[PDB]
Design a protein around this ligand. Structure first.
Ligand code: W94
Ligand code: W94
Ligand SMILES: *[C@@H]1O[C@H](CO)[C@@H](O[C@@H]2O[C@H](CO)[C@@H](O)[C@H](O)[C@H]2NC(C)=O)[C@H](O)[C@H]1NC(C)=O
Ligand SMILES: *[C@@H]1O[C@H](CO)[C@@H](O[C@@H]2O[C@H](CO)[C@@H](O)[C@H](O)[C@H]2NC(C)=O)[C@H](O)[C@H]1NC(C)=O
Ligand SMILES: *[C@@H]1O[C@H](CO)[C@@H](O[C@@H]2O[C@H](CO)[C@@H](O)[C@H](O)[C@H]2NC(C)=O)[C@H](O)[C@H]1NC(C)=O
Ligand SMILES: *[C@@H]1O[C@H](CO)[C@@H](O[C@@H]2O[C@H](CO)[C@@H](O)[C@H](O)[C@H]2NC(C)=O)[C@H](O)[C@H]1NC(C)=O
Ligand SMILES: *[C@@H]1O[C@H](CO)[C@@H](O[C@@H]2O[C@H](CO)[C@@H](O)[C@H](O)[C@H]2NC(C)=O)[C@H](O)[C@H]1NC(C)=O
Ligand code: NAG
Ligand code: NAG
Ligand code: NAG
Ligand code: NAG
Ligand code: NAG
Ligand code: NAG
Lengths: 729, 729
């Protein structure tokens, strides 16, 4: 075979790029698509397009624009620039608004610099933005903005934006604003972090900075004082420039107010009905309030009879939080994914006025998400097909007869496509399917009336032809049995794999709760290079604690992080080592983040299975990590709750057992998520017992270690380490 | 040869231990010594002893006693416990006083906990101590203290103790108080750090600490705002007669007050005469005031007729600071080591009111220090003997005839002993000689009346026996000639050194200004292991900028750090190749501190000479280092002064050239001296240009990386690295 292999440089320089087709639906019939930096509008039925915005119109703009956002009526475009990253989702930017009718920039009443968040209303062209932690509303892009809140205070009071923990662990967003469906009301949360302790770490910046600066971030570690939260709704149709806006508060239910709690979901039901879910700090009890606007009062009333309790006896509520309700047109009923009596996640149908919900799906598999809802059909994604928890397909269920379930993606191309996501148009007249494996990604457009496959948007033809000239690895997805339970694994196998030769094996671990590392997704990554060029098998295993297989598996690690999920990785590797094609003298393990924790726990286990391993930004002790995530799984680190297990599940306590392995420990110094602290305590424990190891800090890098140069450097360094570990003397 | 080598474990575990003879003179005739944890008092003349304090007297004390000190009158002992290290010299401790006459502890009016410094008066049993940054005086150990200052303020005002930079760079001590010779007056300095910027860094502490602490220290980096200083004298004899005794200020001379300046020396001359040396921020100009108590005004006056100017046209003043004066009994004249007209440091004799001094020693060699002064003789240490700048001997010069110079130590044991220090009794009636190489340390007692040897105190016989059975390395001390100038080097050579073989060479570097790494000292260290077990030649070289050889050499790097001292190390490696016993494919370089900087500069020079190197806690950019040290050699980092050279001598600017070498970078995270910042910027610059390298951080370790476990871990880590660098594959 004279073809080149998939090398480290190919991964690092992105030589082989997957093609995408990211569209944005603007109506029931049309979508926007960025082609050649021109924004085109497409008609879904025929495939014809027009140029909505020529790539040249902002040639004289002055700044490089980061992103575009067209108002829902197509009259305005928000130009985003001076982008400055904060955390995972948060950033600041400058904004300008361009009038699409006039074909001119608006120069009056501009959105301020250092704006923290901006959003169009869902209909028309109102704006709401947050600046210096306060909310502002613009009825028209050129008009003076109304100031909604006056309490905004850096690191202390947050209006319409989340603090650190709510951004990272609750909403997965900086935004804490929720327009009503037609833009009449703007709902928002206010966070108060007054008593929340600060994480502090050094930032070194450019060489020219003489004194490092100290970054200070309100961050509750497990057991610490949490932010408090309030919820408000303001009518944006009755604002005055003369009087200050009035925000109506909707207070949490009594069952929440008795102790610490969170706001975890906000979902508008109708123009005049809002739902909110609240979660106790002890995350096994949550309640939904359904609140109606009272025209006489001007107030929002949440009737007790419309209250819905969701709890768990085996673990926490929801995969990472209580799930999202999907309301019908009239908002009188709704659909919601919840754990059934057998512990599998399925769609339940609720009346707003009734306590008992009715499950409309069932079986030993799970609904992943509800994707669209019409009066006749609910569309959802599940891993039902072929009983493969790592595959994903689109289904529809007839609302008048639940026996009638149709798979819409299963048979389109079963050899190439077993993992789908979907994007529906405004009223679900059309949908885009995005197949992402096991073959190359495939984007297709369909119409809902008879599920016609209209056309192929992107089939990655170019890439296919290029990859033909490369010795690409294959992927095996299979299972092993442990106490009569299937647990799935995948192996990235070298080209020309020979079952009679012995290969070194790298165990690629994440293994966080609800994690899935064995799936049918096609990926070009570090593992691709390891298999193709270095002839290493890269395996991953989903053991106890993994998701999408029911709560019996998922909740196995409840109150018990660093136990079964760690043990199951060792057990999988033990079993892989007995296969004929695995060199048991050369088994390695690595992981990032949660997987760095598991890797570290595995290496300190004393198992003798692993010769070496690499931990990148690992958690080392659960009390160091954030409250919302940690306590979900661990409860509170007090003697009357779960302290003994917080204390038993540290990497540090296992330091001695590292004496018989090669360990590389890596961490960014500006990691705001898993603090450098965590690795600092590992290294010190190893030093204290006399264990040699390898280390690398990345100056000013965060949890992603994703700056272009650091990303190349880390993978280069880890490759040297693995190759050295696997070299035969 | 079948003897064991000197191994890493021998070094790390202190297998072969140097015996010391640490004595403390308590009078002209007696000294204290610890034998089997007892404290014996010795008669110097006859060698007989009694037990002064039984090793059992503080069994029921209830604390570990860190140290003790007896009042000069023998009446009390100060017991130090709860010792907590601060910087290089500073610490805090608890103190009890034990009455040696009544033979009981004092329980009344105790020195408080967290005391920063305490000292007995030179005579009697007065105490002065510093607590919460203020000075207190007890006339009697059991009576209430008199408060002296009320301005003390944590990190802001320091009374009687130094701030960070004065401690590290100016006084090499924490204390900033000075009792007059009979204890009447207490002089002290007051430091004001109000506007000095803070270095900030994380300290992680024990694993139990949930949030890391931020250590904040006033620390002026180069060109930043310095502390200001004031000087005061209080009459402690007046304390019990007056409510609040006045601290009389002695202001700096006009020539210092025009700009930033330092107090660099305080020395009492008589009971009523104090001398002070001040140094301009531009450290090539210093002024000594000599100040008399004016009995009729209660004031201190410094006559300009007694003011002495010390300046330098070629560099800074002094080796590291203007030298200390030694006053004759009457306080009307004094001796001082200063640079002569040829650039050599020699003893000059001054009358306090005549500006021209008389040199009493001369030659192409240097006086190291003045050790004692009697009415007839001055005793000093120089490197005159055999023109060996790396040797040290004690000399006696007759004050009534300067042609009469006797070397007291030169010929005592010429092959074993070429490096001496000395400890004189109170009125120099006896002296202990401490020989420290090139053979095993040898401690001997001598009487000044006749300069006859009284007895050997410690000869290290035990160790000599053990070392017979070990294949010890040898040391070659010699010179090479560059541009008509002698430049010294030493080599630690493996046992059975054969000039016909090619050996790997490690260049052990420091090379800061006035450094000396080529000397006659006997050391048991990492180099001993590398030569003995690993058959590596370990070399060091004293190039331009090195000390004890005159200002032509020392001042060569003036305003030009990171040039000649770097180039000369490279050139030294080339010359060691010429010698024909060096494997030119296996030349390594390493150093700590200034040596880490030079190592890094050498490795990024592009010379091709060195295969690999290790930098531990390096400086990387002069603007990151402290003002007093950096500015001494580099002046100010401003466009008008020396900014261009500051910017030109960073490690980071040579990042691209590290592609040619193997590099290991090591730094303690809690380094208060050379901030982790310095290594954080090296790593980032290397990541930025795509260079692979090895790294190790040491959690909560400081500049010394001296905790027991970290010390073993770092030398282990470095050993593996050097061996891998040198291995023939
Ligand atoms: O960063 C973290 C945690 C992980 C946590 N995070 C976990 C995964 C989660 C997530 C990731 C994905 C994706 F991979 F599919 F995209 N989907 N989800 C998800 C979110 C809500 C409901 C269902 C699924 C998004 C939030 C956010 N903070 N660490 C935890 C232990 S080590 C570091
Ligand atoms: O830590 C430092 C500096 C070094 C400086 N330090 C330099 C050495 C100096 C010193 C060391 C020694 C000894 F090694 F012999 F004991 N003697 N002296 C000394 C002091 C005053 C006068 C004469 C000699 C004592 C002060 C104190 N801070 N760095 C400078 C460049 S990298 C880090
Ligand atoms: C959006 O929905 C809101 C809420 O129903 C509408 O506001 C109401 O409209 C009704 C019907 O005309 C009026 O009688 C009420 O007085 C309004 N209520 C409030 C609270 O304002 C609003 O008209 C809709 N907006 C758009 C643009 O369609
Ligand atoms: C944010 O929360 C803090 C409580 O952590 C509030 O401050 C308290 O307010 C009450 C009533 O005004 C005072 O009596 C207390 O002294 C405050 N407590 C503390 C610990 O500071 C604060 O008012 C809240 N801010 C907002 C805007 O809601
Ligand atoms: C939510 O989790 C907590 C913690 O596991 C549960 O509280 C425990 O319940 C029983 C008592 O009925 C005992 O096992 C423990 O004493 C309780 N533990 C703690 C820490 O309080 C609680 O029952 C859970 N909620 C639900 C609905 O299951
Ligand atoms: C001892 O005298 C000093 C010097 O006058 C007093 O310190 C002054 O106190 C006043 C009032 O508190 C301050 O405004 C001055 O700035 C202080 N000066 C200095 C130099 O510190 C001190 O308070 C006196 N002590 C007693 C017990 O009276
Ligand atoms: C220590 O020296 C001081 C300062 O000279 C002595 O105090 C002086 O003593 C003489 C008496 O001989 C008096 O005339 C002065 O008034 C004193 N001066 C001051 C400033 O107090 C002191 O007596 C000496 N102490 C001892 C113990 O000898
Ligand atoms: C597509 O074509 C139809 C005519 O057949 C037209 O009405 C429509 O506006 C076109 N859409 C776009 C986006 O160009
Ligand atoms: C943003 O900053 C620039 C540069 O300082 C300034 O000229 C501009 O007016 C600012 N924009 C707004 C909306 O204030
Ligand atoms: C609105 O409220 C803020 C803060 O409470 C106040 O400063 C401002 O003057 C108010 N304006 C009016 C018009 O009431
Ligand atoms: C040493 O011996 C002499 C007697 O010759 C005696 O006076 C002296 O006190 C003794 N000193 C000690 C410390 O034992
Ligand atoms: C310290 O200096 C500041 C000026 O920076 C001054 O305001 C303060 O009074 C000083 N404090 C003293 C000398 O006690
Ligand atoms: C001190 O240093 C500065 C800068 O090198 C210089 O301009 C000045 O003349 C120097 N003083 C002496 C006495 O050489």
């Amino acid at each position: 075979d004279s073809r080149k292999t998939y090398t480290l440089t190919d991964y690092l320089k992105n030589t082989y790029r997957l093609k995408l087709y990211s569209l944005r639906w603007i109506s029931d019939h049309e979508y926007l698509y960025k082609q050649e930096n021109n924004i085109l509008v497409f008609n879904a039925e025929y495939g014809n397009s027009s140029v909505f915005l020529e790539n040249s119109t902002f040639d004289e703009f002055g700044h490089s624009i980061n992103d575009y956002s067209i108002s829902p009526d197509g009259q305005f475009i928000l130009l985003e620039y001076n982008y400055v990253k904060q955390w995972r989702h948060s950033y600041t930017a400058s904004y300008d608004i361009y009038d699409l009718n006039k074909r001119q920039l608006i120069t009056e009443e501009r959105i301020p610099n250092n704006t923290q968040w901006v959003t169009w209303s869902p209909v028309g062209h109102k704006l709401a933005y947050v600046w210096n932690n306060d909310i502002y509303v613009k009825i028209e892009p050129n008009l003076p903005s109304y100031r909604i809140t006056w309490t905004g205070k850096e690191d202390i009071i947050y209006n319409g934006i989340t603090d650190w923990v709510y951004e990272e662990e609750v909403f997965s967003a900086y935004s804490a604003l929720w327009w009503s469906p037609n833009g009449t009301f703007l709902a928002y949360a206010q966070f108060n972090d007054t008593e929340v302790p600060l994480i502090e770490y050094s930032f070194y910046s450019d060489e020219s900075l003489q004194y490092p600066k100290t970054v200070r971030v309100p961050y509750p570690k497990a057991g610490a004082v949490n932010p408090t939260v309030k919820f408000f709704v303001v009518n944006t149709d009755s604002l005055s420039s003369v009087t200050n806006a009035t925000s109506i508060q909707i207070t949490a239910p009594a069952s929440m107010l008795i102790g610490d709690h969170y706001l975890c979901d906000v979902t508008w039901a109708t123009q005049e009905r809002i739902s909110l879910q609240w979660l106790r700090r002890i995350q096994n009890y949550s309640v939904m309030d359904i609140c109606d606007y009272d025209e006489s009062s001007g107030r929002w009333n949440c009737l007790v009879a419309r209250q819905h309790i969701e709890m768990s006896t085996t673990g926490w509520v929801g995969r990472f939080r209580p799930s999202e309700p999907h309301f019908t047109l009239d908002g009188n009923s709704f659909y919601k994914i919840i754990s059934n009596e057998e512990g599998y996640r399925h769609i339940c149908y609720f009346q707003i006025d009734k306590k008992d919900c009715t499950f409309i799906t069932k079986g030993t598999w799970e609904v992943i998400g509800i994707e669209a809802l019409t009066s006749d059909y609910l569309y959802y994604i599940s891993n039902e097909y072929k009983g493969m928890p790592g595959g994903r397909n689109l289904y529809k269920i007839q609302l008048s007869d639940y026996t009638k379930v149709t798979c819409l993606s299963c048979e389109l191309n079963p050899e190439r496509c077993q993992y789908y996501s979907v994007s529906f148009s405004k009223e679900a007249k059309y949908y885009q399917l995005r197949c992402s494996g096991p073959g190359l990604p495939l984007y297709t457009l369909h119409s809902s009336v008879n599920d016609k496959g209209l056309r192929v948007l992107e089939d990655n033809s170019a890439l296919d032809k290029m990859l033909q000239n490369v010795q690409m690895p294959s992927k095996k997805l299979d299972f092993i049995i442990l106490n009569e339970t299937k647990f799935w694994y995948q192996m990235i196998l070298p080209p020309h794999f020979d079952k009679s030769k012995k290969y070194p094996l790298l165990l690629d671990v994440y293994a966080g709760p609800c994690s899935q590392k064995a799936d049918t997704v096609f990926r070009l990554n570090w593992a691709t290079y390891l298999a193709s060029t270095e002839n290493i098998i890269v395996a991953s295993f989903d053991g106890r604690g993994s998701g999408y297989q029911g709560d019996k598996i998922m909740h196995a690690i409840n109150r018990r992080l660093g136990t079964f999920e760690v043990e199951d990785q060792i057990e999988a590797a033990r079993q892989f080592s007995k296969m004929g094609f695995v060199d048991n003298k050369r088994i390695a393990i690595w992981g990032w983040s949660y997987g760095g924790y598991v890797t570290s726990m595995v290496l300190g286990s004393g198992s003798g299975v692993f010769k070496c391993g690499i931990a990148v930004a690992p958690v080392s002790r659960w009390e160091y990590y954030d409250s919302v995530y940690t306590e979900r799984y661990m409860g509170l680190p007090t003697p009357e709750d779960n302290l003994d297990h917080y204390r038993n599940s540290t990497v540090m306590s296992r330091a001695e057992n590292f004496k018989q392995v090669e360990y590389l420990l890596i961490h960014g110094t500006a990691d705001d998520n898993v603090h450098f602290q965590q690795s600092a305590q590992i290294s010190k424990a190893l030093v204290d017992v006399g264990v040699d190891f390898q280390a690398m800090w990345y100056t000013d890098e965060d949890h992603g270690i994703a700056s272009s140069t650091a990303h190349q450097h880390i993978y280069t360094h880890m490759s040297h380490f693995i190759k050295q570990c696997f070299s035969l003397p």
